[PDB]
Swiss-Prot record:
This is Chymotrypsin-like elastase family member 1. Binds 1 Ca(2+) ion per subunit. PANTHER family: CHYMOTRYPSIN-LIKE ELASTASE FAMILY MEMBER, CHYMOTRYPSIN-LIKE ELASTASE FAMILY MEMBER 1. Keywords: Calcium, Disulfide bond, Hydrolase, Metal-binding, Protease, Secreted, Serine protease, Signal, Zymogen. InterPro entries: Peptidase_S1_Elastase_sf, Peptidase_S1_PA, Peptidase_S1_PA_chymotrypsin, Peptidase_S1A, Trypsin_dom, TRYPSIN_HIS, TRYPSIN_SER. One of its GO terms (biological process) is proteolysis. The active site is at H45, D93, S188. It is found in: Secreted. Belongs to the peptidase S1 family. Elastase subfamily. GO terms for molecular function: metal ion binding; serine-type endopeptidase activity. Disulfide bonds join C30-C46, C127-C194, C158-C174, C184-C214. It catalyses: Hydrolysis of proteins, including elastin. Preferential cleavage: Ala-|-Xaa.
Length: 240
């Protein structure tokens, strides 16, 4: 997250760190949202590499004992069947991970609430992105979970030529594009949290930013629109 602030420890208890085995150690690669005690929602593109993955729930600092973490292996990966790794602009950037254990819920570990199917936020609706991604284009991962205030940019504006043009789809949410604050590499798969009728819901799965830079004016961060995939998600979990 570029231009973020450190989240307080209990703000976003559905946020997970998706990690892969590198050497014999684990490295953060992506975010995700806990949606069942044994299921995580992330970006399809996060789990293209044939890697060993684990999930950390209750994580705040990637490099320090928080005293709240639970570390759980990924047992099964279900990528959206229409996902195409060489075509992120086509959408379908979403995957579900079945965990090897069911995590214990507490103030640091809660299920993320998803929007009702078909819900589209009005232009300039207030949202936070969260994650441990780069804090500057071509920078380094955050140590502590970051948040940034990223208002939505509706499809009509986002798909305009000075924004993302034909790249963005109605199956996506755009947010930010102020040139200061954005998602960045390592935030992929994580949530966009938007406050509706007094409660946050996870409206986005972080998908992509511009090839020119993370925080580029009129290139808002682009997210898979969670409310497009409610049936898909439930179908996967009910068959798995
Ligand atoms: Ar990203
Ligand atoms: Na930690």
């Amino acid at each position: 997250v570029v231009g973020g602030t450190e989240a307080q420890r209990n703000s976003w208890p559905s946020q997970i760190s998706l990690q892969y085995r590198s050497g014999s150690s684990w490295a953060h690669t992506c975010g995700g949202t806990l949606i069942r005690q044994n299921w995580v929602m992330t970006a399809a593109h996060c789990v293209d590499r044939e890697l060993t993955f684990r999930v950390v729930v209750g994580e705040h600092n990637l490099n320090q004992n928080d005293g709240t973490e639970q570390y759980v292996g990924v047992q099964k990966i279900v990528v959206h069947p229409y996902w195409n790794t060489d075509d992120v602009a086509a959408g379908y950037d979403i995957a579900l991970l079945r965990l090897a254990q069911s995590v214990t819920l507490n103030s640091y570990v809660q299920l993320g609430v998803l929007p009702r199917a078909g819900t589209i936020l009005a232009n300039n609706s207030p949202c936070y992105i969260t994650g441990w991604g780069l804090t500057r284009t071509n920078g380094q991962l955050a140590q502590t979970l970051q948040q940034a205030y990223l208002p939505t940019v509706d499809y009509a504006i986002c798909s305009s030529s000075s924004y993302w043009g034909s790249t963005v789809k109605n199956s996506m949410v755009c947010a930010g594009g102020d040139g200061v604050r954005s998602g960045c590499q390592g935030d992929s798969g994580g949530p966009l949290h938007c406050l509706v009728n007094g409660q946050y819901a996870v409206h986005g799965v972080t998908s992509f930013v511009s090839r020119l830079g993370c925080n580029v004016t009129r290139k808002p961060t682009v997210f898979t629109r969670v409310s497009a995939y409610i049936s898909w998600i439930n179908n996967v979990i009910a068959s798995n």
